């Protein structure tokens, strides 16, 4: 009796962040196409929470029905690697889906546009898809004695999609589930996931329509996913989409973007330039 | 009724290379410790071979009993990636073992010394072991349009043990079996395997006692495994070990070695220097 949808959506959300969930479920999670198109949840770890805290979550779930409560996962602010692995492994086991969008509770995604884009891909462009805004020259954090047991794999991080939002095909999620007990953690979930997929025949696809870096590049009506959004920002975008059928009251390019050059060494992937959102 | 041994040994060998197998089975594969210590085979792909060719192999197997014939594997000279994955996946399913040595038919290994070294490791030093001579600054081959579907993961190859000989714990081999259908091929089996293990919590251990690079560094009595050995070389070493209890009639350092610096970025791993075999 597994739930089934075309596009699963998993929004990482800490136990206490109920007010953010309220805005998200009332805005971009509500505009989710026809029945059967989307299955969407907020992924919350409940390990180590007390009775009152767990009761609050159960009340929220009874009211809204959109929480994925992961009882074995200790929710943590510093590194969401464990959370991302847990919620994807759960999804592989429990939901029949073709693609999954991972997002944060400061993301905003146009689910209707994402659905239409995915539906328009032919088989080849759907197979083993890992889709988002990639970095191949991510600077690696200072190491210590822990590196003896966990070598640095590259002078820069292995190519990975930034964690403001990325999409995976179901097949890739199954590989993560199968391999779960072996996987190493890097300092950030997005970095970790890119390393996880390093061995795999995977169709990485860089797309400037993902405004998913640690700072937003502004507002483009072309964006499918954008990150670092305040609640006010989410409410404004939701309203503009409803009023005018576009994301932005005013498009603005705050920071230059790039197109990932797969013909170059990864350190040379990412020249910032005009003309790209 | 699975075969069981402490150390499995898999020597990659092409169908036609029967004379090399004859020397190997008569030399370093024969000095293999007590019953139950070693299970050793020559891994040969038989896909696409004709009746006469297959009969020859079956006759060899009836006489010697030391072939691993892989019927689904098309034996190929240019890249042994497929062979290595096939023979390790087979081993995971069919043999109970703690460690496996992968070697070529121009390798020479001191199996007694390898056994003693592995037996002397405490639990921590046995867990998830990937042991050999590592490179972190392997220069990457020129790409073409195929790179769009298979991005270059690093400016240099991800750290990997050179293919003249390396050792894996059984747990790691199980991860490869589980993940088999997803794994990408690089241009060489050794490079490929290092990438395969990139996502994993793996205890990589560099050891100058592995003379396993594309050129031998000479002859050291400290070597556990050495590569680029002629049949004459194998016969001489076998004789010296029997006569004098050492590998080398004369130790000679033809090329400098290095100690892999895990505290540095991988591009800076590998300074060649005196004092190291
Ligand atoms: Mn975020
Ligand atoms: Mn060789």
From Swiss-Prot, chains A, B:
Effect of substituting residue 27 to A: In SEMDJL1; decreased localization to the Golgi apparatus
Result of altering residue 15 to L: In SEMDJL1; loss of galactosylxylosylprotein 3-beta-galactosyltransferase activity; decreased localization to the Golgi apparatus
Cofactors, names only: Mn(2+)
Tissue localization of expression: Ubiquitous.
Annotated phenotype, changing residue 248 to S: In SEMDJL1; loss of galactosylxylosylprotein 3-beta-galactosyltransferase activity; normal Golgi apparatus subcellular localization
Lumenal side: 1-277
Consequence when changing residue 104 to N: In SEMDJL1; loss of galactosylxylosylprotein 3-beta-galactosyltransferase activity; normal Golgi apparatus subcellular localization
Keywords recorded for this protein, A-Z: Disease variant, Dwarfism, Ehlers-Danlos syndrome, Glycoprotein, Glycosyltransferase, Golgi apparatus, Manganese, Membrane, Signal-anchor, Transferase, Transmembrane, Transmembrane helix
Outcome following mutation: residue 134 to L: In SEMDJL1; also found in patients with EDSSPD2; decreased localization to the Golgi apparatus
Outcome reported for the amino acid change (mutating residue 107 to Y): In ALGAZ; uncertain significance; normal Golgi apparatus subcellular localization
Effect annotated for changing residue 13 to G: In SEMDJL1; decreased galactosylxylosylprotein 3-beta-galactosyltransferase activity; decreased localization to the Golgi apparatus
GO cellular component entries: Golgi apparatus; Golgi cisterna membrane; Golgi medial cisterna; Golgi membrane; membrane
Effect annotated for changing residue 180 to C: In SEMDJL1; the activity of the enzyme is significantly decreased; decreased localization to the Golgi apparatus
GO biological process: chondroitin sulfate proteoglycan biosynthetic process; dermatan sulfate proteoglycan biosynthetic process; glycosaminoglycan biosynthetic process; glycosaminoglycan metabolic process; heparan sulfate proteoglycan biosynthetic process; protein O-linked glycosylation; proteoglycan biosynthetic process
Phenotypic consequence of residue 165 to S: In SEMDJL1; normal Golgi apparatus subcellular localization
Record note on what altering residue 155 to H does: In SEMDJL1; normal Golgi apparatus subcellular localization
Protein's pathway: Glycan metabolism; chondroitin sulfate biosynthesis; Glycan metabolism; heparan sulfate biosynthesis
Catalytic activity annotation: 3-O-(beta-D-galactosyl-(1->4)-beta-D-xylosyl)-L-seryl-[protein] + UDP-alpha-D-galactose = 3-O-(beta-D-galactosyl-(1->3)-beta-D-galactosyl-(1->4)-beta-D-xylosyl)-L-seryl-[protein] + UDP + H(+)
Example GO molecular function: galactosylxylosylprotein 3-beta-galactosyltransferase activity
Glycosylation positions in this chain: 79
Compartments reported by the entry: Golgi apparatus, Golgi stack membrane
Family classification: Belongs to the glycosyltransferase 31 family.
Function: Beta-1,3-galactosyltransferase that transfers galactose from UDP-galactose to substrates with a terminal beta-linked galactose residue. Has a preference for galactose-beta-1,4-xylose that is found in the linker region of glycosaminoglycans, such as heparan sulfate and chondroitin sulfate. Has no activity towards substrates with terminal glucosamine or galactosamine residues.
Known disease link: Ehlers-Danlos syndrome, spondylodysplastic type, 2: A form of Ehlers-Danlos syndrome, a group of connective tissue disorders characterized by skin hyperextensibility, articular hypermobility, and tissue fragility. EDSSPD2 is an autosomal recessive form characterized by an aged appearance, developmental delay, short stature, craniofacial disproportion, generalized osteopenia, defective wound healing, hypermobile joints, hypotonic muscles, and loose but elastic skin. Spondyloepimetaphyseal dysplasia with joint laxity, 1, with or without fractures: A bone disease characterized by vertebral abnormalities and ligamentous laxity that result in spinal misalignment and progressive severe kyphoscoliosis, thoracic asymmetry, and respiratory compromise resulting in early death. Additional skeletal features include elbow deformities with radial head dislocation, dislocated hips, clubfeet, and tapered fingers with spatulate distal phalanges. Many affected children have an oval face, flat midface, prominent eyes with blue sclerae, and a long philtrum.
Official protein name in the record: Beta-1,3-galactosyltransferase 6
Gene: B3GALT6
Residues represented out of the complete protein: 53 to 329 of 329
């Amino acid at each position: 009796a597994r739930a089934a949808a075309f596009l699963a959506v998993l929004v990482a959300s800490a136990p206490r962040a109920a007010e953010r969930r309220s805005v998200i479920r009332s805005t971009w999670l509500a505009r989710r196409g026809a029945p059967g198109d989307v299955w969407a949840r907020f992924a919350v770890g409940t390990a180590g929470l007390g009775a009152e805290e767990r009761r609050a979550l159960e009340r929220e779930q009874a009211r809204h029905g959109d929480l994925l409560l992961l009882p074995a996962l200790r929710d943590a602010y510093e590194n969401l690697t464990a959370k991302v692995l847990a919620m994807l492994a759960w999804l592989d086991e429990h939901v029949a889906f073709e693609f999954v969008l991972k997002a944060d509770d400061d993301s905003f995604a146009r689910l209707d546009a994402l659905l239409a884009e995915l539906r328009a891909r032919e088989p080849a462009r759907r197979r083993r898809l890992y889709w988002g805004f990639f970095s191949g020259r991510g600077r690696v954090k200072p190491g210590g004695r822990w590196r003896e047991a966990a070598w640095q794999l590259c002078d820069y991080y292995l190519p990975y999609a930034l964690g403001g939002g990325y999409v995976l095909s179901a097949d890739l999620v199954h590989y993560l589930r199968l391999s779960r007990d072996y996987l190493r953690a890097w300092h950030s979930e997005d970095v970790s996931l890119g390393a996880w997929l390093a061995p795999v025949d995977v169709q990485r696809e860089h797309d400037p329509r993902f405004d998913t870096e640690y700072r937003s590049r502004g507002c483009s009506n072309q964006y499918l996913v954008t990150h670092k959004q305040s609640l006010e920002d989410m409410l404004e975008k939701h309203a503009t989409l409803a009023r005018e059928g576009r994301l932005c009251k005013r498009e603005v390019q705050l920071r230059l973007s790039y197109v990932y050059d797969w013909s170059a060494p990864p350190s040379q992937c990412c020249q910032r330039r005009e003309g790209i959102p």
